[PDB]
Every structure is written in C-alpha cells, then in structure tokens.
C-alpha cells in the first residue's frame, strides 16, 4: 500500500502538473515565435519603402 | 466613364484625373472585352483614387479600359418579396426566380442605433432546444452565438433552429434571415434541400456565399443579410432572426483582404480592427423604442484548435451576450445537440424568463438543474479518479442524474422540436430523483406545485 | 480677398482615408484644433501639420467624403461645456446630447454632420451668489451656487485665466449664456457666465496632490476587506470576456460613497448603455430620495460607433470628473473599457504609418495611459478655500484571451496601485464577483489597515491577514489534495480547508442581483469575518484538546449553516451575526465533553 | 547674434522640421516661441542642407506654424551646477520646483558628460555596509559600484531603496553619502512616499533631486537622468564628495526613447526598441567609479520594473550586460511576506571579491558565502520536490536541506525594511544556518575555516 501510494502520487503529479505545465508552455512558445516573425517581416516591408 | 487607369498592382488599382470621387464609393470597371467587374474606392487622394476590384485584376488592359463611378457605396435592393428567395453574396438572384423590384436602396453599412432610442430585449423566442429554451434562453434582440468546431454538427443545429424558431402568442410576424459565409457547395445544398423540404424557405430570406466566391463578397455577405434584416424588422415590424455561419470563414476572408492591402497584422495575423469590424455586425441586433419587430442574431463559428483564446471566438465573446459551446466529449457520446451548459451562458435570459415570457418556474428550475449537473459531473469525475468507493450515497445519485441529464434532457435530436412547456416538464421530472431537501435553490412554494 | 470680398480661411480636402483626412490651405489653424470636414460638416481634429496641409483625426464616419469639399476650423481645441445642465444626461464621445440628437434629427439612428450644443443654452436656472462685491478672486474661488439636483449644488467658480475683483454680482434666474458677474481684472473688465470651456487633452489645474488614505466603501466584501481602493486611488479590473468587469462597475457606480460618478462607455455594448439609463432612474437612495441618475454623468461611445470617438469619450469623462473635483467633491470615473481606447490608438497608428511598438499598439501608449491615471488622485483644488477634491479611477481592461501580458494591462499595472484581476474559472463556477484572491492585490491595504483598525477599535488588519493566511494555505493544500488526497490531510489542515471554504462561499461570493448581499456595510463585514474566524479559533482549541476532525464537523452542522446565511442578515439585525460567536462556544463546549 | 527663424516646415507629433536655416549644430538646445508667448525647449536631432529636425520636450500641443518661431541657442543642453544645489528640487529638465531662490551657477556642464579615462580610473574595492544581509554578505555593494535593483509592477522596490540610503556607511570612517535621486515618469504617490522617508531620515537636505512625474510630457524623460549624473559627478570629483545615485523608473526612460525612435521612423530592433539601447544605457551607467587622485566617488543603484516580469526583456537584459551584477526582487518572495523579497540565486555582485576578506569585512566571508548559495539552491530544489512528490519521498539528507532553505528565507533574508544588522551579525547568522548540515557536506569551506567557526 505504501509503494502503491508513492506510484499513485507520482502518476498524479505528471497528469496534473508536469504534463499540463508543458502543454501550456508549448502553446505560449509557439504563439510568440509566429507573431514575432509576423511583426518582423512587417517592419522589413516598411524599411524596404525607405 | 473615365479611362484614365494609371496603375494596376495586384488586386488594387489607381485611377488618376478624377473629380469628386468619394470614399467607399462603388465603382464599375469596363474592360477591353466588354466584361464588367465591380470595385470599391478604398482611398481617394487629389485627382487619384485607389480601388480594389472584387473579382480581381486578371487580364485587365489598363489602356483601353474604362471605370465608372456610381456615386454610392455598396447597396442592397430591399423589398417585401425577399421572403422565400435565395441571393448570392452581392444580393443577386440565385434561385433563377422572377425579377425582384426593390422598394428602397440601403447602404450595407447602415446606421448606428441611437442608445437612447434602443429598447432592451423582451420576452423570448422558442429555439425548440431544451438546452437553449430553458438553460440559455434566447431573447428578442440578443446577440447569442454558437461556438463549434470542425467536425461538430453545428450545421444541423443551425438548420434545426432556422425551421423551429418562432414567437409564442404571435402569428405570421416571424422571419429567419439565413446568411452563409464561405462554405462548400455540398454544405450549401445541405441547407437548400433542408429549407425547401421542411417548408422553412417560405418564411426565410437566404443569402448564400460559397468558398470559391470572391473574398470581398465573403466579407460583404453578412452586411447584406443584416440590411435586409433591418428592413423586415424596423420598416415592416417583424421579429427577424439572423443565423450566420461560418464566422471563421469571414475572419479568414477578412485577413485575406488585409494581407492583400498590406495592413499591419495584429494578433495571430488577423487585422487589429477585427473587434471593431465584428462589432459593426453584431451591434446591428437589438430592439428599438416604439418600433415593432426585432433583429436577433445567432452567430455560428468554429473554434480553431478547439481553443477559446483564439481571436475569432475570444473577440466575439467580447461583443455578444453569452455563447453556446459545443464540446467533443458530448458529441462522441451521441448527444444531439452536443451542448455543454457548464461553459455556456445567456446574459439576457432574465428578460426572457418569468410569467408571460415563460413558465413561472423557469428561473427556479433553471438554476437548480445547473447546480445539480455541476455537482453531478463533479461526482462523475470523482468516480474515475478515485473509484466509485470514494463517493458517498448522495454523490452517486448526482452522478446518476448527470447521465440522464445529458442523455434525455440535452440529447433530444436535431429534428425534435420541443416547446417551452415540454422542456420545463421534462426538467421537473428529472428533479424528482434528487430529494426535496437537496433542492435548496427552489422555494417550498414551487416545489409543492410542480414536483411529481 | 476673392471676387471683391474676403472672409475666413477655407480649406479643401486633398486626401480622405478612413478616419484620417488631409486638407490644404489651413495655415491659420493649429495643432489639436477642431474643424468641420466636408460638405457634411463632420467633426475632426488636427493632429499633424505639414506646411499648409493638416492631418485631421475625424471622430465621425467618413464614408462619402472626397477631395474638393471644404474644411472650416473653429480656432478652439477639443473642449467640453461645463455648467448647469450637465448632470443626469448622457453624451457621446464629443459630448453631444443623444436625447437632443434624436429630437433634432427626428430619427432613431445616428446621422452625420449634426451640430448640437452640449448643454441647454435656453434653460432658466435661478442663480444664487455667495460672494460680496469687491472681493479679490482667483481661479478656484466660488462666486455662487446652483442646486442642479436635489442634493448636488453646482457651485459656480472663477474660470482659469481670470484674476481680479468682483465688480457687480446679483442673484436671479438666468441662462448659461447671459452674464451673472463682472470681474475687474488687470487687463480690463470681464463678463463671466455659468458655462465655461476646458480642453479635454490637458488636465485641469490644482494646488497639489494628496496621498489617498481614505478607503472607499464599495459595499463589495471581496473589495473593501482584502483589496480596498482608496478615495482618489486607481484600480484596474482586467478580465476575460464575461468575467464580470462591467457588473463590478455597475455596483461601484451605485454603492460608492462618492458625490458624483462618471461612467465612460468606451467601445462597449449598446445594450450595456441602455440598461444604464433605465435602471439608474429607479435606483432611489432611501435617505435623500434622489435617484442614482441624479448623481451621475455618463458618456457613451459603443463599439460600432466611430472608432476615433473612443479616445474622445475617455478624455471627455475625466475632464468632467476634474470639473466637479475642483468643487471639493469626491468624483469616481468609470472607464468601460480602456482596451477599446487602445485599439483606437492602434487603429490611428496604422493609418498614420507610425512605427508600432508592442503588439501593434503605438509606442506612446505608456505615456497616454500614464497621462490619464495621474490626472486622478486626492487633490487640493484651486482657490483660496484650499478645498479637498478627489478622483477615483476604476478602469476596465479587456485583454485578448484573458492574457494580462498584453501591453495595456501591463502599462496599467505600472501606474495604478489596485489590481482586481478577474478569473474566467471563477465566473464559470458562478463565483461572483470573480475576483482572484491569489493574484489580485492592493498597495493601500497597509494604509487602509491602519485607518480601518482605528475606527473599528479592533485588530482588523490582523483578521484580514489571518483570513488571507488561510486562503493562501488553501492554495498550497489543494495542490496536495489533487496529488495525494483529501483523506491524507491532517485534522488541523483539513480544518483549514473547511475554514477557508467558509471564507469563499460565505464572504467572497456576492450576488449582484440579490438585495441582501448586493451591499454590505462596514460594520456588517466585521461581524461576519469575526464569526468565521472565531470558528477556526475554537476549533483548533478543540483539536489540540483531543477532539477529532469529523467530530467537530458533524457536531457543528446546525451552527455551520447560520454562517452561510449571515450574508442575508439586514443591517438592522446585525446582533444575529455577533451572537453566533457566543453560540459557537456553547456548542463547542458540549462537543468537547 | 540672436539666431531665430520663422520659417517652419512641418510639425508631426513630438518632432519638428525647420527649413531655410544655417549654422545649426547637432545636439543644439532650442526654444519655440509660439503665437501666444509660450516657450518650450527642444534639441536638434538632425541637420542637413538648410533643414533641421528637432524634438520638443514638452510636446507640440496647439502650435500654429505660420506665426511661431524657433530660437536656436547654439549650445547643447546644460545644467547650472553649484553647491547651492544641495537640498533642492528640480524638474525633469532642471528648473527648480520647490519655489525657492534661483541657483547662481558656478559652472554650466553639458548633460552628456564625459568619459573617464580607464587609466585615470581607480578600482572600487571599498566596502559599504547596507544593513541588509542579502546584500552585505551575498551580493556585496561597494563604493563606486554599478549595482541595480530589478523589480516589477507593484513590488516593494520603493521600500527597498529608502532602506539602503538610510543605512549606508563605510567601515572605519565617518563619511556621509551625497544621495542623488531622479524621478522618471513615476506616479506622484511613489515620489511623495520617497520624500517623506527622506525627511524622516534627516538626509533630505543632503540629496539633490530631479522630478519627472507621470503627468509630465514623456519626451523630456530622455534628458532627466543625464541631469542627475552630471550633477552627481560634479559633486564627487570636483567637490570631493561620496555620491550615491538612485533612479526610478528606468523602465519609463526606455519607453521615452522608443517614442522618439518611433517618431523618427528609425530601424527598430528588439520589440520596437531602438538598436542603440545598449549604448544609450551605457552613457548613463558608466558614469560611476573612482578617479586616482580625487577623494570623490560615484555609486549607482538603478531601479527598473521588468515589463511582464521577464528578465529576457531588452530593458533588464541590456542593463545586466552593463552593470556589475544586479539585485532581483521576485513576486514569489513578496507573496510570502519576505521583507525584503530579494532573490539571491539569480542576483550577483562582481566587485565584491576585492571588497571582502580579512581587513575589509571578515576573513571567512568568501567561504561562507560560496557555501550558502550552493546549499540554498539545493534546498530550494528540494522544496520544489517536496511540494510535488511529497515530504516523505524526499531523501532524508535532502529533507535536512528542505528546512535549510526555509529558515534561510524567513530569518536570513526576511529582516524588515528598518533593520540595520551589522556585518558581524550577518556572517555569524550565516554560519548558524550552515551548522544544520553535517560537516561532511560543507565541501567549499576549507578545514581551517571550518575548524575556527
Ligand atoms: N458580481 C456579480 N454577481 C452576479 N453575477 C455576476 C457578477 N459579475 C458577473 N456576473 C455574471 O457574469 C455576466 C457577465 O458580466 P459582465 O461584467 O458583463 O462581464 P464582462 O467581464 O464581460 O464585463 C453577467 O451577465 C452576470 O450574470
Ligand atoms: F462582456 Al465583456 F469584456 F467580455 F464586457
Ligand atoms: Mg463588460
């Protein structure tokens, strides 16, 4: 029962903390990179007009 | 007819040496082969005027071409004969019926409702769906959207509402303006076949815009429907319902034209003025003081990545009062329609509930059903994480109630029109499972009167 | 001149694009000058000037305007009319009267090119002077008052720029246009009226600012207890869609101890504005009998309305909020919502072809917001009287997807000291107001704690800190319950989660539409928090004596209900709450034995 | 002669272009006489042919072009330096705001300053006792050092700055610190609190201050910090004083330069900020240190609020590449009532090795210091494991550490904003936190230092 409980909380943390923290992390990472390159090419069009 | 074409760059076009060209003026270009393409003045400066042709600028000879300025923005010919007809994105006849004789010509942009002349939503409009009519009541003049996803049966629910919507204790004063925005041909004939067989075409005004139609015709399609909707509601006094889908395809067509004109992209590539542009469409709904009829809008949009923080569903939630969520867990279970009432909300349902707008028990039953589901789902979750032995005897009852709630109350069928009476009666029958001591949100009065 | 006659400078339009219009032959005009544009005569504002050409920020829709149409300037900046007849009326971004709008245009909709004064220039107000002839006066001194409402006295002041002695003054019934007093200044004699103009982009002058140390009674328990806003403070309410940003403002616009509220409908829903002019005329104060509409001026520029007018609506409201602040009144300014003003600047920035900063918004967004919130605060108004006026800023922020990392929320947090961070998960669980007690904060809680402790003559700051200590321990405990289990919690820790549960659904939750909970007096909050705290105080006394966890819970079932209904105890029966404290001890003593 | 032209070309936002001019120098202070009599100062940003582009500090609000004039002064923006500046209140441009007599300037120095010769420089090894154990022991502050305090929106950054200037002194000496403060776009409530603390201390008279609040125009914020560092080095190297510099908020300063960077249509860099931000911040931070042969010294304690609480933001990132270390305030430590909420793991001081040791503070400071961080890092690493995998799951050796980091935050770091603990009381406290762990786990302290303590 003690080893069952160690594994149980091991499993629980992964589903409720580690994996969700990553899933939300990946969302924010990919979000930033796209708008950054989206806004980066935007000024390059403005600089091309100079 | 001016023939001074100066430049033709992509979808844009410049016309020099003009006099009196106004902003947002609809133009008419006559090419070297006699073919006619319509455009729109995006900007006018000095004797120059930059326009964008709807169909594009492919195969245009700037030398021998001529442009005619109509002197008016994009308009719509409105009349009483639009009921039962089908128009395209630009309001042109598609059913090949008789020629329409317009009574007046209105700007597709229209005019803003004066906030002092605006009337608050009143009474209620039957949606024939238990999850709407009771838990998330639709009110005359309310902006209540339906959030869906690619694969979810939001087309069936849209057709279900468009043939089951009506006004109680009122006769022959209700119409449905169905506007399709950038859909496939097979999805278009879905509604075409359903509207005619169910007879709902006889009381509906339909505007169809396909996916292969010009992207400017996609962003001008909902404006055509609302202009005809405001004509039937404010000048003819009809309770007009406006169903629109898809709004995502409108957002894509709006970002396509924005990239075509090289505007500064906002969040997720979409135009920064997306909230403003969406608001010019959703704020058309509402009631007017001393004016019979009402304009009610039911937006239907698919959430990309099933994400609610996306600019399309998020910014829509900032305009519309509430939303109707369609989840995947309920759709896989066979619930028709798969409406999750936990994330859904109707902010004007108070002006729809109560006696004479609904059954006196409406407000009391609604709130007790909600709390019983929320606790029931919560108990159903406890049975998977911690097993069935960690829940008390009262917990298994709420978990059993949530099963019947999703399978009998919500799951009614896309072709099953309930009434407000049958909906409330079905809800009262479900409350008898829970003890009278657990119905802590309904007063002893309505309990002794309706509980079986 | 021209053709045998001459007149004022007439422009001609050379460029029309969306809300931005450029016209030539305008050299006599200046920056920030209003001007009628086109044959229609729509309102605009000069923002940029190149040689004779001016760049106009038009506040109306420009569809159907082209080059060749003339442009006429006014010579004055973007200003507002300040005098009797301003209260109990709602205005657009440019402060036009919407009720007068419909009457003139004779249409339920909004036309264009409609010229209308802000105030009613032909209404007869009986003026009542308060100063003697020959008294030296400056800007701020009072020369008379006019009872605008039943309890609001519109004290006529000396306009800015005039300094001298009162030559002749007399009471009587007059309009806002005819002179009521004559001042013998150093530059000659001047005729003053009850109406004065002031530019909205420049804040009204004061003597000096004061530290806001007077906590405002909002009636909301999650606010006045843990995250208090001071009279003159700045509070931002950023939250996702449908999280309760407006509802919080409607409660503050109706249960605040302020002399005047200024509600700015900046880019919000049109139904959200009609609901105001209908419910507020019915919200009667049971003491004075005057309706809430009698105590409030609201400005409305909805979302579908002109985009540039969103900026005008913000500066119009805070200027009116400053006009009544100088009378020694405590004015509250409501901005619903500031996120739509920021879109108008980003929209304008994209038209001006300016370099975008963060997420497309212009680089000067930090200053424009800082320029606004600093115009608030508890001030020493002008004049010899040294009177204390204040402006309390309650602005709502609407971030995309509820992400507060967006620009306008961060720039707001820098210049304000109160952050009412709304949460979407709380709004889904019907937890209202949806104020996140973990993320929200108030930099005034320490000073409010000193003030609050004194009036109560009780260690109230130590009760709020202890109640906060239980709620922060609940967050740390919930992470273990989801990991290990609630049955794995000790008797003392499981008690903490139950006491924290009482803090949540009995004290923090407040229904907006229920009469018993919608307002909670300061004395009622103390009795409620003391009863909840006395529960855990004697419960840990029992656990340390040998009692079990479930033994205390099952033996206190009847008492635990009386606390959950304590929010519905009327103010005239507050003895019921405090009696539960003594009642708990009696019930606990038998349980121990 | 009086160089003044009346041929304005265009006015766009804070920028302005004058044509048909001659003899206009770069970085030249100007004045704008309008059609109503108002005067607004400005500086020249570009001079080509007969044209001159200038930036108006107070902004161009209500300016008629045909009836206005531009008065070129022929010199860069200067500050009237004098010893009578002590205890005075100047605005963000330099005009006195305390309603007192006008200063009779002993000199007029360019606000841009001058570069100190590195051979003429003197390496700062002096020790400053700040009364804070998290600074005096962990990230030692020295006289003439570039040590900023990184904070966020709402964090008690203003409480920590008053604590340091109240308790700062040097060992075996009685010299006082000539504090120089500069407000950059902050709110009135922050500035007033700082004023009341300075009054309470009794050092208000010693301090010289420049004030730019939030309601002030943002364009002039570009010159306000250059006002202070010109007056700071004036009192240090020329008057022979030990000058301390504390500035806030530096975040609003960078926002001001981006406004002009955006108005000038320049080539942007990271997040729209100008590409020369590392250089522009360097013109301000490198105005610090000691000069051989002069008894003066310039110590800098900058303060900035990290936008979005992100260290990788260009403002706190480039600051770290210029300044010697940093002091980071986290919202997590302030969340727990830790006063001051100093996170000493990411913080660092780079001039301390020469400022500690026998004769300066304590013989064993370096060995304890090194031993502290390593054990705190692992103790914090173990606590972050206890809250996830459980208390019992943690190793017993790590569990002793889990309590090591708990007491090292509530007792060691948490000391209050009014506690002046001595360096002897700070280092003795540190050993008491190391006596918990067994002697075998203290591997970065030698046996000689382990035995004596
Ligand atoms: N304090 C409250 N009490 C009761 N209900 C609330 C409260 N705040 C919000 N709500 C509910 O949330 C809905 C949306 O609130 P609102 O303030 O309009 O959201 P937003 O954040 O979009 O302004 C309301 O219709 C109301 O039913
Ligand atoms: F309803 Al909202 F912000 F989403 F006002
Ligand atoms: Mg709202």
């Amino acid at each position: 029962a003690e080893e069952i409980e160690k594994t149980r909380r091991r499993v629980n943390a992964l589903e409720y903390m580690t994996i969700p923290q990553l899933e939300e992390t990946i969302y924010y990472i990919k979000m930033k990179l796209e708008e950054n390159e989206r806004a980066e090419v935007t000024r390059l069009i403005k600089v091309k007009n100079m | 007819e001016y023939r001074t074409i100066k430049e033709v760059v992509g979808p844009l076009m410049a016309v020099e040496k003009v006099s009196g060209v106004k902003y947002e003026e609809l133009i008419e270009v006559r090419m070297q082969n006699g073919e006619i393409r319509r455009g729109q003045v995006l900007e006018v400066q000095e004797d120059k005027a930059m326009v964008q042709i709807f169909e594009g600028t492919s195969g245009i000879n700037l030398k021998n071409s001529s442009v005619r300025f109509l002197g008016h923005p994009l308009q719509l010919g409105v009349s009483e004969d639009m009921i039962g007809r089908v128009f395209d994105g630009l309001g042109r006849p598609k059913d090949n019926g008789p020629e329409i004789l317009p009574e007046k010509y209105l700007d597709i942009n229209g005019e803003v409702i004066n906030p002092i002349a605006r009337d608050y939503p009143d009474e209620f409009i039957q949606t024939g769906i238990s999850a709407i009519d009771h838990l998330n009541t639709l009110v005359r003049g309310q902006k209540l959207p339906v959030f869906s996803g690619s694969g979810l049966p939001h087309k069936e629910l849209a057709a279900q509402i468009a043939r089951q919507a009506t006004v109680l204790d009122s006769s022959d004063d209700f119409a449905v303006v169905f506007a399709a925005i950038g859909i496939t041909f097979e999805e278009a004939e879905f509604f075409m076949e359903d509207f005619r067989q169910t007879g709902a075409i006889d009381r509906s005004v339909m505007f169809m815009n396909l996916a292969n139609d010009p992207a400017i015709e996609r962003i001008a399609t909902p404006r055509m429907a609302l202009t005809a909707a405001e004509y039937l509601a404010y000048e003819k006094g009809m309770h007009v319902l406006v169903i629109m889908t898809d709004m995502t395809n409108y957002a894509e067509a709006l970002r396509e034209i924005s990239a075509a004109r090289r505007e500064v992209p906002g969040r997720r590539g979409y135009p920064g003025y997306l909230y403003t542009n969406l608001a010019t469409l959703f704020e058309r709904a509402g009631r007017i003081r001393g004016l019979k009829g009402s304009v009610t809008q039911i937006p239907i949009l698919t959430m990309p990545e099933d994400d609610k923080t996306h600019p399309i569903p998020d910014l829509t939630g900032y305009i519309t009062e509430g939303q109707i969520i369609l989840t995947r867990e309920l759709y896989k279970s066979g619930i028709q329609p798969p409406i999750d009432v936990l994330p859904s909300l109707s902010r004007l349902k108070d002006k729809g509930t109560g006696a004479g707008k609904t059954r006196e028990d409406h407000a009391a039953t609604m709130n007790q059903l909600f709390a019983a589901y929320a606790q029931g789902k919560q108990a159903k979750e406890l049975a998977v994480v911690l097993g069935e032995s960690a829940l008390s005897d009262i917990d298994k009852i709420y978990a059993k109630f949530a099963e019947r709630f999703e399978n009998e109350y919500v799951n009614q069928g896309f072709y099953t029109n309930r009434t407000i009476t049958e909906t409330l009666d079905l809800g009262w029958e479900l409350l008898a499972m829970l003890p009278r001591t657990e119905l802590k949100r309904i007063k002893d009065d309505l309990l002794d009167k309706y509980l079986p | 001149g021209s053709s045998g006659s001459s007149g004022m400078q007439i422009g001609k339009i050379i460029k029309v694009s969306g809300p931005l219009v450029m016209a030539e032959n305008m050299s006599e005009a200046s920056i920030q000058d209003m001007c009628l544009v086109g044959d229609l005569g729509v309102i605009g504002e000069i923002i940029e000037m190149r040689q004779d050409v001016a760049s106009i920020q038009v506040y109306e829709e420009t569809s159907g305007i082209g080059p060749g149409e003339p442009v006429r300037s006014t010579g004055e900046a973007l200003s507002v009319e300040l005098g009797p007849g301003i209260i109990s009326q709602m205005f657009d971004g440019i402060q036009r009267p919407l009720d007068t709008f419909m009457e003139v245009t004779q249409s339920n909709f909004l036309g264009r090119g409609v010229q209308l004064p802000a105030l009613d220039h032909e209404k007869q107000w009986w003026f009542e002077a308060t100063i003697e002839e020959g008294t030296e006066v400056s800007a701020g001194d009072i020369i008379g008052y006019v009872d605008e409402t039943k309890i609001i006295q519109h004290k006529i002041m000396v306009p800015n720029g005039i300094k001298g002695t009162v030559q002749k003054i007399e009471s009587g019934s007059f309009t806002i246009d005819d002179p009521i007093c004559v001042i013998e200044t150093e530059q000659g004699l001047k005729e003053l009226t009850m109406m004065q103009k002031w530019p909205v982009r420049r804040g009204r002058p004061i003597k000096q600012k004061l530290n806001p140390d007077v906590p405002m009674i909002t009636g909301q328990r999650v606010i006045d207890t843990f995250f208090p806003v001071t009279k003159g403070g700045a509070a931002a309410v950023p939250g996702p869609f449908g999280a309760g940003k407006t509802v919080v403002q409607h409660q503050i616009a109706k249960w605040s101890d302020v002399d005047l509220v200024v509600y700015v409908g900046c880019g919000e829903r049109g139904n959200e504005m009609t609901d105001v002019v209908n419910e507020f005329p019915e919200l009667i104060d049971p003491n004075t009998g005057e309706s809430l509409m009698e105590r409030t001026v609201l400005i409305a520029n909805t979302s579908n309305m002109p985009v540039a007018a969103r900026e005008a609506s913000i500066y119009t409201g805070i200027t009116i909020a400053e006009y009544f602040r100088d009378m020694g009144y405590d004015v509250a300014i409501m901005a619903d919502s500031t996120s739509r003003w920021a879109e108008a600047l980003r929209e304008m920035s994209g038209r001006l072809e300016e370099m975008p900063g963060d997420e497309g918004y212009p680089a000067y967004l930090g200053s424009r917001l800082a320029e606004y919130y600093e115009r608030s605060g508890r001030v020493i108004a002008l004049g010899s009287d040294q009177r204390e006026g204040s402006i309390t800023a309650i602005s709502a922020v609407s971030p995309s997807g509820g992400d507060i990392s967006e620009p306008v929320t961060q720039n707001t947090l820098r210049v304000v000291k109160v952050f009412w961070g709304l949460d979407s998960s709380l709004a889904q669980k019907r937890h209202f107001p949806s104020i996140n007690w973990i993320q929200s904060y108030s930099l005034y809680s320490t000073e409010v704690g000193r003030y609050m402790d004194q009036i109560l003559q009780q260690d109230w700051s130590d009760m709020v800190t202890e109640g906060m200590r239980i709620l922060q321990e609940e967050e740390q405990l919930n992470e273990i319950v989801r990991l290990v289990g609630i049955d794995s919690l000790s008797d003392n820790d499981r008690l903490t989660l139950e006491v924290a549960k009482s803090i949540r659904e009995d004290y923090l939750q407040q229904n907006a539409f229920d009469d018993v909970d919608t307002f909670t007096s300061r004395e009622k909050q103390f009795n409620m928090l003391k009863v909840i705290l006395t529960f855990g105080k004697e419960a840990r006394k029992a656990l340390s004596l040998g009692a079990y966890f479930n033994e205390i819970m099952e033996g206190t079932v009847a008492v635990r209900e009386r606390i959950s209904r304590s929010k519905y105890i009327p103010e005239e029966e507050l003895a019921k709450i405090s009696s539960i404290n003594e009642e708990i001890k009696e019930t606990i003593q038998l349980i121990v034995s």
Side-chain angles (χ1 to χ4, degrees), chain B residues 66-67 69-82 84-86:
Chain B
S66 60
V67 180
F69 291 87
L70 295 174
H72 60 75
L74 202 43
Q75 293 177 332
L76 164 65
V78 293
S79 176
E80 70 175 35
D81 306 321
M82 307 180 73
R85 305 296 297 271
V86 175

Side-chain angles (χ1 to χ4, degrees), chain B residues 89 178-180 182-184 191 207-218 220-223 225 244-254:
Chain B
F178 197 88
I183 61 175
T184 62
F191 300 109
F207 294 91
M208 310 299 290
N209 175 263
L210 311 175
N212 61 343
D213 288 353
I216 308 181
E217 294 188 5
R218 305 220 288 260
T221 299
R223 306 186 182 278
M244 293 175 297
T245 170
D246 193 331
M247 298 307 302
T248 300
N249 302 137
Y250 175 89
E252 306 297 337
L254 192 59

Side-chain angles (χ1 to χ4, degrees), chain B residues 148-150 302-310 313 326 328:
Chain B
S148 168
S150 295
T302 54
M303 298 184 295
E305 320 282 358
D306 294 331
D307 171 62
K308 204 159 58 181
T309 70
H310 186 270
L326 297 178
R328 303 292 181 85

Side-chain angles (χ1 to χ4, degrees), chain C residues 16-27 29-67:
Chain C
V16 152
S17 212
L20 181 64
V21 174
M22 301 212 297
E24 65 185 357
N25 196 345
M26 302 273 290
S27 61
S30 306
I31 313 295
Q32 257 103 358
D33 272 11
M34 303 176 63
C35 49
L36 306 182
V37 182
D39 298 321
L40 279 301
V42 315
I43 274 189
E45 176 185 15
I46 297 179
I47 51 177
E48 297 177 357
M49 189 83 177
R50 288 159 202 111
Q51 260 271 284
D52 33 6
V53 149
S55 304
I56 305 179
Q57 175 183 307
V58 177
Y59 293 98
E60 302 196 45
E61 213 71 73
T62 57
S63 185
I65 301 179

Side-chain angles (χ1 to χ4, degrees), chain B residues 345 347 349, chain C residues 239-248 269 272 422 432-434 510-513:
Chain B
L345 176 61
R347 312 185 191 185
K349 59 190 175 299
Chain C
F241 71 99
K245 294 185 297 305
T246 308
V247 168
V248 167
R269 305 169 173 90
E272 287 196 336
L422 304 190
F432 293 114
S434 327
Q510 239 200 281
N511 191 315
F513 300 72

Side-chain angles (χ1 to χ4, degrees), chain B residues 257-280 282-285:
Chain B
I257 303 299
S258 174
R261 303 172 186 176
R262 285 175 179 81
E263 302 172 339
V264 183
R267 182 167 167 263
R268 302 297 182 86
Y270 289 95
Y273 60 96
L274 177 58
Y275 172 82
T276 301
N277 186 276
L278 281 164
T280 54
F282 296 149
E283 283 289 329
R284 314 273 260 180

Side-chain angles (χ1 to χ4, degrees), chain B residues 317-320 347, chain C residues 239-243 245-246 268-269 272 336 340 397-398:
Chain B
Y318 281 97
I319 319 182
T320 68
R347 312 185 191 185
Chain C
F241 71 99
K245 294 185 297 305
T246 308
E268 281 323 273
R269 305 169 173 90
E272 287 196 336
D336 189 26
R340 315 310 175 189
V397 178
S398 306

